[model samples]
Target: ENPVNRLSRLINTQFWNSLTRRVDLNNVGEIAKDTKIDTPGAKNPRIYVPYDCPEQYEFYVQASQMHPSLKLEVEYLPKKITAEYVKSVNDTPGLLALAMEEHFNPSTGEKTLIGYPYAVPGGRFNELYGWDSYMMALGLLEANKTDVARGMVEHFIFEINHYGKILNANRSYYLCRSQPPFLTEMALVVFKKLGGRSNPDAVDLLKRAFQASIKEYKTVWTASPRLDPETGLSRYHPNGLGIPPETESDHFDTVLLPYASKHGVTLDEFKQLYNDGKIKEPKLDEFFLHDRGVRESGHDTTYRFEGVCAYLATIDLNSLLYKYEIDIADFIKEFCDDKYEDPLDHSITTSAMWKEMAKIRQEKITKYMWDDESGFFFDYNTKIKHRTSYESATTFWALWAGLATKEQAQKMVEKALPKLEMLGGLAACTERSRGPISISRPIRQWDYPFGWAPHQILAWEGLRSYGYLTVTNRLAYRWLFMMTKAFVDYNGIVVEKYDVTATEGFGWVNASYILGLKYMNSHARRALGACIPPISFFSSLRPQERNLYGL
Candidate 1:
């Protein structure tokens, strides 16, 4: 809980305060009178610390009553956690840092480094994200540090190898989904950044991963049949472990609208479909719930794509595979005798090989999903070949991958500006389908017109690609504005996502977000550094720092 929330909750606990005690910190007049905090200022401003022992209440009460001006400091030590503390707990040698929760299970005296949403104690911290780790690896590589970077990749490979797959999240609740396909992409990025040096062990691990994923994809597809195998195929139900165990197959809930359909939409349409009633919200609980509540990521098809496993046809997956295919081709061509020449070890640079795949996808997507009337993309069920309109984060990805045209992009930007543009920055999704943007409820963070890293990344990337440099720069400035404010608020640390409705919820809770934010800053710095036009700063740096800086 945030300090303000914690303080209010703790001081208002029934055991600490009488049931009759009113704690409406929002009631401006009452708050000012009771706490005398300020004239028309926020009421009952006190330090908030997680609650633990009941004695802590007494400590606070005594402190508050002892001084007329001083308010009670609601202080309870949350299980001590720091980067070093996490390393100590994991006991992994050569540990550079840890980027997750420090959960304390008093009943079992267990301290676990639970993955987000995966392990639960950390609550969603354990989920796998491709870009998150890549950004982190950039830093690790820059430091010439391979161990910790290896540790991070090992974490991902462990999940994939152990369970035979990677989900958007980890905990069984999130077993059916995947996020940006960045594993092989990240490995290659790190490898190249390492100057193409040979790390036999790393290569071995990479091969194992390539084999496992390829085998998994092939096995699932061969065992189950669909039509499109290469591209134009959707993965509605990617097969693997973490799925409902055999006994409970009849009771799993699957997502109906995947992320693939989010492309080809005006900003308004996208916002409406995802956030409003433009698209009918599915009765997710009906088909989505397993023995427990677990839903798949929204981008894949159900189980299989036309004749092929869904994973086999994903664009990003293909993009990753293309890279892997190249790597394997090179390695096999050199490391093995001619006998190792299998179809898999062939170069994939030709458009003819992948062109048909893209054509099939583009055709099906256009015919079935695109609403030419509105200039947006909607979901088309290849099974029944029916189309429905829904919106989500996947919309911008289409533009990112060169799947959308300049005119279409412009239309989307125009439609998006009115509501998605916030004083803070662009938000992730909108609140009202037909009206002005407003703050979302309950948490009200992810909802409404709020922006996330992925959104900004996609938006910025798309703009830059199409020569929307001014727009891209403006968006970047807005993000930095929000990020800077957030960092100052949080002691110079940037966060995950900012609330366009309100500036909150920016945090790493995992190292990836922190790295992602830093990357953005560094990228901005480099862009600025390019304009000097004369001798570079390295012309003046001491040799020692120049080498350390990789200059």
Candidate 2:
């Protein structure tokens, strides 16, 4: 409803109540709009007090004299990115800074809050998401917004204290899961900013973060639902209480129908089941929950899971936890001296405990996640005790987390790089599909053709960490070039994802079909073979249909 209409109804109903003697207005103050409303204001505003009503003119005078107002305070980051294309965007650093800012007031009835302020990922997002905030901090630090970055970590601490975990974001709806375990990294970034662990402030912050990380690791992540005691690997299993709004939107429908179609059903059949309230039928719960859990992994709609996300012990998730353990161990060794202790009773885990945890995680990850046949790390299905066939950029996390051996890294780079890297950057996964009419339907958003910001940053950082600096620079340059090009071509907007393959208008082309072509680059010939059957299942939309997403 429009605010103006809502205000009008409110005033009219109060008038009716007073006139009918159901309410008293004698002691009530007058109501008026704020003057500085950022638009033309009436020279002589009129109130609809009834003719011949008691105190009509008096009420008008009181209304005119009443003061109602709104004021907003805005702050700008003191620095900006050096890249030309980054500077070309409307307030690039400012937008990034804004994306990092969040406020919650319980008095104002807001549900999202931490004791300290934080940053959110920009555009269609307003919460300090777990993993996204860590990525956002990199950009913040790059732009010299050091205080903001530090504050973001502090907010995560507040969340850890309040919720017993750093959740997916600061929403009750997100309490069921957390994003990638980046709290350690989040603290590490701030620690570096504060002159490393040697700084007194940095050590204090690290101790708090390390202790919180241990609690989070033990209490939430490695606890019953997420941890596989049998395999000693952790998986993302979102404790969903009910349907998520994401699963109710056009976005969900778009992802769902194609998946159901792969199961030998049409969109109508799926819709019929959904409309008949049979989505909750016992047989379909696994399918529905899988969709829910996929979002928990921060790969919201990836075909990599093949619709069994909850049951899979993913390489990225395990590798991230491994990093968390290593980070805890490293921090404890560096800062946990006799002089330094948790303020309350020294309840923190020992450095040895963290090392043991890291060792176990590393061993489990190597044992289950690595596939020698493919020379890559893949998600392992705990339920089936086998590695999933999908090849994803997640394999890089093992290298990033320092869990993969030199031989394993060499093999991963050899086997996966060519397939994963693209003209834009790395695809979330290879376009190859193991099931159904994969080419005709929409490729999963987290799969091929969609290069996301965080993944690009993570892969570049991971590549650099392993002394693959040349390849890292190449990957970084390619990603930067693509973002710059897209910014120039798309009217200065950087989207949440990009068509890394640059085949947006050209449509999907099966690799087999493309491989057979004498003239591979020809668009018309590609479409003629029916490999480019339809406009992208994700992007193709009617004007009214597009409106369903509602920004």
Candidate 3:
């Protein structure tokens, strides 16, 4: 997909420019100070405003006089802009660096829920997500906030104990699904950052993590249909049904709804029949399960699933579990020494159990997940007892999880680079497979043209692990260049995803209006390149120094 027309682009530019021009720094500062908004009932009760200014109160008062909706409660608003607080935030380069603040929701704190202080992924997402915390911890420790990073792992431990598993995020709605399991990896990150073996606190943390990891693996992952008895491997299965509020796909329903319409039946009748075992379209049932499974996989939507996610043992999910198992075993063996004998005999017996689990998982993955014909790893569909042919970025996980042989790794690298490598970074998938899925719109954000930060980081690390230094270095260079250039071009904004195929960054795209504009102007091509210096001069720095901004 390409950019909208020049007129639409100009309109977008005008919209942003006019808004910024109208809201000058003085106005912004005042609004930030005077806006005392409260969540009627929230975990953190303290109403937040950007440290507070006297002019803001006056501005609000005047604004309220003109517009009743702008009315303020001066009594509740606190106008206290401490010089120290302002200076601390000012010293931070990007909003991302400043967004890394400790959270303490009073209600969550009362019962010791989400028990630790951690960094939040900014913007609409302002909570510690299960998988996000692990990636964010890398930057947190890189910036030397070792305690903050450790607190994140501690929070995950709190979640596993309280919520059965770490939730997709702290929010109640997210209780239905969890992000890709990386809690064990996060604990190990904290352990290494906190001086590994020498630190007693780190050792204790690892022990706690070991217990939590085991509980999660047994109770959450290996539970019921998630684990295939024949393959002895896992698949992405969400806790329940009903479309995830976050991923309400029109095509998702369209794929199934039409099948019902073909039989002159309503969707309800079709679902009733399917559920009642009166209908025998196993593919339709698989489609519904795959919809939920994608959410668990953390991709939310992808052509890789092809209406078969429920039946398939995915490469990424299996690899992560494989790593989690190994990490648990290592943590137990390294820390669960005889110096402190556990009353439950957790040290020796638990370690042995985890080691066996890791061994079996590794063996199963090699036996089933690996496709010798293609010389690549793929998702194994347990229902059909065959491998799904969709080649995806998750194949890189084989290297990252240490599950591939030298020969296999070489084949994987050769197979992956051409399909995945792009100007911006490694794309999450290739254009080769998109047509097969047959959706009007793109299947998912984790697909061609959409290069996400986490996947890019994972792919690079995976490539480097196998001594594919040249490929890794080139990828690193391209991604760094793209991000830096985009940072400058967008005037210091860091989006969640980048269009590796184009010079544009990716986020919410309401293409309906843009499509109309394209008809009006035949010259309309996809968004083109443009550049501007960052409002903050972080863009002026070299690539290495620029990374400190963590854009």
Candidate 4:
């Protein structure tokens, strides 16, 4: 464990920090030059800045000047940056703007969202991510990098004010989509570490962040499409169209093959015609909309939602909003007057009002998301008006968010943990729930047998908060032991697919592994040092599978 701890400590040195890249003028061209994001037959990589963001726009201008041959196109957002503008300018309806020569990078072509430097999940993802920054900042704080962590939080505020939302990643194409909300959660972490309440500087920062968080709450998540009218719960409804440009070329071949044949054209021909707006297929249009929704959910492809993520009031989402409600109230009670001028609508309001919002949300969640019989939280399909039986690691999210009651928490510890736990850590969902993988349903990485860093980290916090220390320690050690073994077995590089299936030590895992150290006891550390084996996490897999996954 100490060796793993040591490597975790050295993440910022050579291991984890290497995954990050700056978005300033001096470094933004690196992404323009990288060939990894290149999708065949897609439009050239384009970067767009809010028409009002002179500073961000100027930086891109400088970048374009420096790299005269990178083949990147920079443009000003066509319309005013507003709530209306956000909805109007997705992949559909054709967002129009000016792409002058001054805005073009000629070195290479790929889409990117520019921002102040924030940690990315890996080298492959060089842009600032929505929720990953929250996890990354916490890990940075744990590793004594307060400035980097604070800087990441600062960028979120910037994104909120300028981009209109915290994007899936700061990519031009992702302008209409946002990932899970962790903006408030991350802001609070940075505020406390900098000594808010007792320090004027920190208080000022928090006050500024307060308005931004409210704007995100009011303008984005609680707004139309996301805020389902019937259920009164938010969902992942992304705004985009025509095969999201970020996906790998031919990734949707399975789904598109039928549509192509129906159109009496080759797959490539149909795709080109559809993307060019020369053809129309009503079903394909709906599928891409849900596909965008799935990406925003951050569990990119999962059977749990069954490709209707837009229609589900996910347990993770509602619980996060519950936490958001609680935090906003706390922020007001701690700092502002009893009744203050609310920034979102410039109306007089009180902290109690925010608490009331949480109360209503709690009641609705109990009705819609809580499965009393199973003792686990589940996503509610608003369209079907039913709770999904598919169990996922996100069930523990309510505990972390403080939305679950004592009995609810205890029931999760008793009944749900058994189903969610895997050999390494908590798999995203149970095997029985995900069903078997076949040609009809290929492996969805976000489902059973695949564990992720965000899921593992939050579950540890959720379990520990409920006084389930033994399970917290057990799960952390299991994950850390397997991760460390993979680290040692491979060269210095850690893999991205980390679980019974495969590994991501950089970005979130880098942070999660470093933070998980607190939960381990001395004996667990000794076991790690002794190289004690509870059988290797990958032992059950065929040797060829290990080689195929680069274990």
Candidate 5:
């Protein structure tokens, strides 16, 4: 009945611990789960170990990779993953991985990445992801799992150094894409949690983090595709080609039916033939670009961006880059001397330099994104040169990043906050933003009425930063009440996303809950259970229905 303590205990114990995946010979099934999602039999999943790390190869294994969740049959990898292929193949260079929800087409197989341990997001996903890992790190730190938390930070830097970007995940197909930028923030959290700079390990960790973060900012984010020179801001641009290989082949049946009809081929034949690169439909190419961009944004399937993600410089991306710049400057000042140097260029710089870059970016954002009259930040469609008035909770990201001025934040509190506020907590975007729905325009999981962990968590932090104590508390209480109620009412299990309009549904990747509970004060925690809200509050909650627990 005591949901707060019960949820905390579960999160501290089973949530993070059960979700963690380590690469070792003894636990072969865990690591290989993402590999053979499109197969039958006890398929040998290839655990690609980098050629340079013979030690990791020797210590791990050759042939014992396993996964019993899915069936793996023949015509796999155009062949099957083998112990010999993992160890002996000259073609396989570096081994890498992630928990892939999308099936791996046997023809494409799994392209690998450097083997590093990470926590799974739960349910169908048993692998690490870009933004998800950062959230997991926060939960790990909150639970006082410093070693695992630090490992996540360390692994990300290694990911940047080795893979050229903090990939959407370590999966081979994910190599071309990356999720939202959270490495710097995650590093800081880990640093603070590890007793804040006093720990020698923490000191060295930031030193490396600053370097890798700079590399990531300069390389992945600030370069082509991601950085648009027009606005001098970043956009979510994934470098993958064709239909993203990780998505199930049939995911686009509806999308492809019209095109299939145009080609006079069955949808099945059209999808297979098109993906194989036989079809020359340049029209589908542009759509997939936006599709990949949406995936890279980590708010996949949201109608907020609609079909224009590829052409938009989003509010969330620019704010995160600002945070990245701020974090880098902060790291350099705290750890390195006030003076900075890029080991890559051996060029000396100063804290002011990073801060200056932040100064410029923030101003540009103020000019383009921050809508004064409307009191909201809008995603700029770079192609159309106009800001779309889609009211997404992403505006709160500015508060989290400290990009919003007090005045701007005040405006946001009055205008943007109300647009996003819902009974459960902050909705991802307003229903108006989702526009009309039809068979083709179905409900997106990231659209209105759906409250996700990351958006809600960030909004709470941002609101608190702007000094809204009561407001943040109330929001946190509602979310806590909903989540706690669901935990008691539903099989006492967490799933993925929550339809926050009511106390319901998925929270599988639960960093939000773990981090969010910290925002609540002593009183709210006490009130969550043992004490109940007034009947009027429950009446307001249902309006149409009666309270189930106390009625």
Candidate 6:
């Protein structure tokens, strides 16, 4: 009896975004309760739903039940979805949709926990993360879509607000932890650029954003009972938010931090203190005291680990912490100049902290990460309580954060050359498991030598930051080059996750091929030093990059 009418009624509700144009797998779940429609590959050849789900899935019922009175059944109606939404249909569309819906709210409805544009396969990730969203926001910003960028930050707020913090990614097991602590820097850029409503409003919003991140640290990194009286290097413990237990966690594959001796509580505390004004004077050497009791204890590293995290001396985490200290120092210098009385002295002290932290982090990295024997920074396992020579993209993240020494940075760049430096960007992992690096074949390409945009961007940017512009430009072109090549061949469609081996399509987001292709083709020219314009030089240097050039 009028199933179409019934379905129309269900569709009329505010569950999905309906331009009356099309249906994406993401929204199909919400509308399918009544529609009971089996829509597959309807959008185009690029889209595909899992076979078992010919009808619908649990989320359809759950979402429909959220209203308790909606249903749908469509004989055939165009799915009103977007190019962006369509690209994210490969893996767990339901979970991905839920995540995105929580943030984007395309229906112009309510929002929660912010959101990400899409989800990765296997339900591996459920939300937008720190470094990931930064790149995504860059895409949004490049398009001049400031609202989307703001939405991104707003989603982060939702994440912080709901979980009292954000995680690296949302795991079904735990939904609380946070990713790299770059949210403040990213959000500040967005707010200053987009949330330019009032000067006072901007400052207040940044202050709140900064505060939330500080709170996030407290919730995750607990201060240790022990403190180094002389160096002020206090012990700290991992909050261990989303880490799975040892029994359940996978092999060398368990999420790990390879280069950590201490939990970095001192760094977090220093940041908090500097921001809260509890300490008008901040010291660098006082923090990062060695001999602290922080060791990697998570299952991935410790196997006999306790608590929630796979504690390891992750090179990536330590590098990020180092950058964070530098940022704090920079912030203090700026703050002092704007309002404080004695600006020069404060600036000098902060600058000294920058230099001190940079040098110390570099030294520690060399000792813990650099493997002279292997010629690559092996991810150190604190669980073994000693450094292991395992290779991962995490090694280059330090370079991205600008924490590597000049010599070390050059060595890192050279080390990444053959394996990582692909036509467009770099690979996610190496091709061999034991030698240098390796990528797992007959498996998805994220690990074991597959390249990821996030890591590639980080590494490339890191190199470029230190005058490796040629290398940076070359990689950007590679991404664009491969994408445009595929587009011309495939009538302008693309996929996510290029085969690090073949440098061709091997993963999801078919439409991302289009978006990414277009983006790459257009921007690659400027980004990759191809027919670029000349810059106008200025007489004076900005305070930040200013130096005497050794007179």
The candidate maximizing lDDT is 4
What order do you get sorting by TM-score, best first? 4, 5, 3, 2, 6, 1
Report lDDT (CA) for all predictions.
0.39, 0.57, 0.57, 0.73, 0.70, 0.42
Which residue pairs clash within candidate 2? 100-119, 101-119
Which candidate leads in TM-score? 4
State candidate 5's TM-score. 0.84
lDDT of 3 by residue, 1-551 (tens): 22223323532443222211122212322222211222232212111222333343344344445544423223121233232332222212111101112235666753211123555454333445667667666655554556666777776776665555776664333454667888787788788888887989898888887677777877678886688888888777765533232333343466758778877898767655654457767666566667767766778667777477777888888888888878766666666651333334344356667668878877788888777655568778897888666768788887788767898887777665677777666788887865444446645677776877777666666766887755654555455545556554666454567787722222111111222222221211211222222323344557764443233
List TM-scores for all candidates, in order. Answer: 0.48, 0.65, 0.65, 0.86, 0.84, 0.54
How many Å off is the CA of 478 in candidate 4? 1.2
Clashes per candidate, residues 3 or more apart or on different chains: 41, 2, 3, 17, 17, 48
Instruction: Give the least accurate 10-residue stretch of model 2, judged by summed lDDT.
Output: 503-512
Candidate 4 ranges beyond 4 A from true positions: 34-46, 66-73, 81-116, 276-280, 501-504, 533-551
User: Candidate 5: misplaced stretches above 4 Å?
Assistant: 35-43, 60-117, 276-278, 502-509, 530-551
TM-score: model 1 vs. ground truth: 0.48
lDDT of 6 by residue, 349-383 (tens): 44455557657766766776676544466544443
What local lDDT score does residue 407 receive in model 4, on the 0 to 100 scale? 84
Q: Name the lDDT of candidate 1.
A: 0.39
lDDT of model 1, residue 242: 22
Regarding TM-score, does 4 or 6 come out ahead?
A: 4
Off by over 4 Å in 6: 1-66, 70-130, 168-173, 195-198, 221-311, 336-360, 372-375, 434-444, 502-551
lDDT of 6 at 362: 69
Candidate 6 lDDT for residue 259: 14
Candidate 6, overall lDDT?
0.42
lDDT for each residue of candidate 1 in 65-174, tens digit (9 for 90 to 100): 65546443333323432323322222111101112223678899765442211111122222234344544454445444454455455555655543334444333223
